[PDB]
Design a protein around this motif. Structure first.
Motif, short mmCIF file in Angstrom:
data_model
loop_
_atom_site.label_atom_id
_atom_site.label_comp_id
_atom_site.label_asym_id
_atom_site.label_seq_id
_atom_site.Cartn_x
_atom_site.Cartn_y
_atom_site.Cartn_z
N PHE A 182 2.62 10.44 -7.04
CA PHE A 182 3.58 10.79 -8.13
C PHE A 182 2.36 11.27 -9.31
CE2 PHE A 182 5.30 10.54 -12.20
CZ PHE A 182 6.53 10.81 -12.13
N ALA A 183 1.18 10.50 -9.54
CA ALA A 183 0.32 10.96 -10.45
C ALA A 183 -0.47 12.14 -10.46
CB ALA A 183 -0.80 9.61 -10.72
N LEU A 184 -0.79 12.43 -8.94
CA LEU A 184 -1.39 13.62 -8.53
C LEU A 184 -0.44 14.79 -8.62
CD1 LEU A 184 -3.79 15.00 -6.56
CD2 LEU A 184 -1.94 14.68 -4.85
N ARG A 215 -8.47 15.80 -9.13
CA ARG A 215 -7.45 15.51 -8.26
C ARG A 215 -8.11 15.04 -7.04
NH1 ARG A 215 -2.34 18.25 -8.82
NH2 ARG A 215 -2.26 18.59 -6.45
N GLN A 216 -9.19 15.24 -6.69
CA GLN A 216 -9.81 14.82 -5.29
C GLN A 216 -10.05 13.37 -5.35
OE1 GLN A 216 -10.47 16.81 -2.89
NE2 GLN A 216 -11.24 15.41 -1.68
N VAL A 217 -10.24 12.49 -6.34
CA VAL A 217 -10.36 11.39 -6.33
C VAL A 217 -8.96 10.48 -5.75
CG1 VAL A 217 -10.46 11.31 -8.75
CG2 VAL A 217 -10.18 9.24 -7.83
N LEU A 218 -8.02 10.98 -6.42
CA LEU A 218 -6.48 10.70 -6.04
C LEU A 218 -6.29 10.86 -4.54
CD1 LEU A 218 -6.36 11.03 -9.16
CD2 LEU A 218 -3.85 10.28 -9.04
N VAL A 219 -6.72 12.22 -4.10
CA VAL A 219 -6.59 12.60 -2.84
C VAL A 219 -7.24 11.69 -1.84
CG1 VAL A 219 -6.49 14.33 -1.17
CG2 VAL A 219 -6.49 14.97 -3.57
N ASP A 220 -8.49 11.43 -1.76
CA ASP A 220 -9.34 10.48 -0.97
C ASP A 220 -8.64 9.06 -0.92
OD1 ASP A 220 -11.09 12.55 -0.78
OD2 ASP A 220 -12.38 11.68 -2.12
N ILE A 228 -5.42 8.54 -1.29
CA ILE A 228 -4.18 8.61 -0.64
C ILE A 228 -4.32 8.50 1.03
CG2 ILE A 228 -2.26 10.22 0.11
CD1 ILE A 228 -2.62 11.10 -2.85
N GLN A 229 -5.43 9.30 1.47
CA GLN A 229 -6.00 9.23 2.58
C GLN A 229 -6.38 8.23 3.31
OE1 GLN A 229 -4.33 12.12 3.61
NE2 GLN A 229 -5.84 12.36 5.27
N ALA A 230 -6.99 7.19 2.41
CA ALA A 230 -7.64 5.88 2.67
C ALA A 230 -6.32 5.07 3.21
CB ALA A 230 -8.57 5.29 1.62
N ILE A 231 -5.16 5.26 2.42
CA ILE A 231 -4.18 4.33 2.62
C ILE A 231 -3.44 5.02 3.97
CG2 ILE A 231 -1.74 3.68 1.88
CD1 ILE A 231 -3.25 4.10 -1.17
N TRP A 262 0.61 -1.12 -0.07
CA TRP A 262 0.17 0.13 0.14
C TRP A 262 0.86 1.36 -0.14
CZ3 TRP A 262 -4.24 -0.04 -2.10
CH2 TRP A 262 -5.33 -1.07 -2.11
N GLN A 263 2.05 1.33 0.73
CA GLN A 263 3.05 2.25 0.61
C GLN A 263 3.62 2.30 -0.77
OE1 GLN A 263 5.08 2.71 4.84
NE2 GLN A 263 3.16 3.07 3.69
N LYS A 264 3.85 1.35 -1.63
CA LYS A 264 4.21 1.45 -2.97
C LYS A 264 2.83 2.18 -3.61
CE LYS A 264 6.88 -0.74 -6.55
NZ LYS A 264 8.36 -0.62 -6.19
N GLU A 265 1.70 1.78 -3.34
CA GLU A 265 0.53 2.28 -4.20
C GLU A 265 0.38 3.86 -3.69
OE1 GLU A 265 -1.04 0.92 -6.76
OE2 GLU A 265 -2.61 2.75 -7.12
N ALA A 266 0.62 4.00 -2.52
CA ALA A 266 0.56 5.53 -1.90
C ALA A 266 1.31 6.37 -2.87
CB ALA A 266 0.91 5.80 -0.63
#
Length: 222
Positions: A194-196, A207-212, A214-217, A185-189
């Motif tokens: 990077f994409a954001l 950008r919001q979808v990516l932000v949520d 990241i927080q979930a992780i 999950w760290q690697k996925e974060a």
């Protein structure tokens, strides 16, 4: 004859089971399981001619034609009520393909005790599918192999009600938070971060979808 991935799948196969291994890889899993006295017998389903013939020959080579049937058929078409299958493994496929195979043979699953599922991806959509079709997760494991990460879901008949967090991370995996779970999950974060990093800067919704995500992780790793 089997990898750590399938060995882990194997460890959930109940002693004495009659096994259906869907899309079996050369029949090595069922062969292994019968040879070590772990199951009584098995069916290896194969939908394509090549993998079918390899599974037939391996079973013959091992002298196990009386204990392992090899059938040419798609997904759950490989078995019938009369086979008395008690455990089904479906490993090495994308999670929505696993769901499609379960859905098409949904009418035969009531008398199976246990499903062991190892999706290569879309694990979240498979957990939604399971929940919506009367299945509960009773165990989860996660491993790393050659630098990739693989989840295994063990499932039996019954109700479950997953949070969004359990859907995405696994009700058992997110509770254990093993070292392998952290690496995945760290690697996925960092991928997400990077994409954001790329997409800027207006269009907030996007950008919001990516932000949520990241927080979930961050939350599940705290």
């Amino acid at each position: 004859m089997i990898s750590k991935r399938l060995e882990l799948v194997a460890s959930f196969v109940s002693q004495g089971a009659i096994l259906l291994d869907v899309g079996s890889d050369h029949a090595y899993l069922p062969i292994e399981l019968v040879e070590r006295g772990q199951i009584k017998s098995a069916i290896a389903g194969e939908v394509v001619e090549g993998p079918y013939q390899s599974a037939v020959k391996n079973v013959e080579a091992h002298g196990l034609k009386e204990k392992i049937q090899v059938r040419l058929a798609n997904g759950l078409a490989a078995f019938e009520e009369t086979d008395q299958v008690s455990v089904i493994t479906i490993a090495g496929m994308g999670g929505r393909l696993i769901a499609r195979i379960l859905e098409e043979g949904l009418g035969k699953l009531a008398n199976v005790e246990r499903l062991i599922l190892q999706p290569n991806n879309r694990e979240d959509d498979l957990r939604i599918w399971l929940q919506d079709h009367g299945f509960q997760i009773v165990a989860e494991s996660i491993l790393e192999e050659a630098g990739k990460f693989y989840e295994i879901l063990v499932v039996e008949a019954g109700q479950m009600k997953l949070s969004a967090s359990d859907v995405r991370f696994g009700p058992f995996l997110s509770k254990e938070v093993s070292p392998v779970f952290v690496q995945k999950w760290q690697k996925e974060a960092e991928k997400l971060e990077f994409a954001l990093g790329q997409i800027p800067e207006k269009n907030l919704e996007e950008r919001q979808v990516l932000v949520d995500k990241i927080q979930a992780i961050k939350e599940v790793l705290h």
